[PDB]
């Protein structure tokens, strides 16, 4: 499992418009990246993603250059999810085969639900280096929400 | 790979409303089942699924009791996809971990796109027995469409 202080693995995340190398996409920026177990699922669609949409400008007021969401979904599902949620301020990234997630050691087996998905987490990434890493407790939503990240930028 | 004349594996397919045992869900019925590589993808959303929605009553006029679509997606994505497409006549089934698909030998590795997905195919299932099996050629859409299935029910 990746830890604070490490640079992200040189992996790729896809977007429908491109296979972004995350080391190039996040370079020179303060990036907030939060991961969800699945597009269109309840917690992700009713709490997690909406929380970052609502606080997007507050986060950018505190120096964030880019807010991004990643999920083990394909880019077509991620694009349709962003439109359903009106997540214009959020960059939706697809980890369709969970290769980025596995390289982080942050995968989890949801078995019959949806196979390998990402654990729920949130990071603050400064020029590719993981500065803050908030990984949720199983089936819990407490530390990866936008409010906690905002309070981390308070220090 | 499963073949005509065999009964389906005693696997489960999920729906958001339930882990349907397919041997019980399809029993006593003439079922048309078609599989797509992914919800919200272009061919599936613009050609494959719409073709079965448009010809649903014609298929049932020729003795089909149930039209079902399966995909290696989770049940939340499948439900949201059905609503986006207005697929009220179609039963959307989720094979989230591709266990049903792998038991059929009809999986395919889409690598970085979306990991393991289903090959595109269409079956006619009579009381759990595969009567007709139309499996597409790679990246081809010719034999699994509603029109071909309709012409199979012609004989």
Author numbering:
A (entry chain A), B (entry chain A): 1 to 17, 22 to 159
Lines from the paper:
V. vulnificus Prx3 (VvPrx3) belongs to the 1-Cys class of Prxs, with one conserved catalytic cysteine (Cys48), and has been shown to be involved in pathogenicity in a mouse model. Cys48 is the CP residue that is crucial for the function of the protein. All three crystal structures of VvPrx3 revealed a protomer exhibiting a compact and spherical structure without a C-terminal extension region, similar to the previously reported 1-Cys Prx AhpE from Mycobacterium tuberculosis. All three crystal structures of VvPrx3 [reduced Prx3 (C48D/C73S), oxidized Prx3 (C73S) and H2O2-bound Prx3 (C48D/C73S)] showed a similar dimeric assembly in the crystals characterized by an A-type dimeric interface, similar to that in AhpE from M. tuberculosis.
To study the structure of Prx3 in the reduced state, crystals of a VvPrx3 (C48D/C73S) variant were also obtained. The CP Cys48 in VvPrx3 was replaced with a non-oxidizable Asp residue, which could also partly mimic an over-oxidized form (Cys-SO2H) of VvPrx3. The crystal belonged to a different space group, P3221, and the VvPrx3 (C48D/C73S) structure [named reduced Prx (C48D/C73S) in this study] was determined by the molecular replacement approach. The crystal structure representing the reduced Prx3 showed a typical dimeric interface, called the A-type interface.
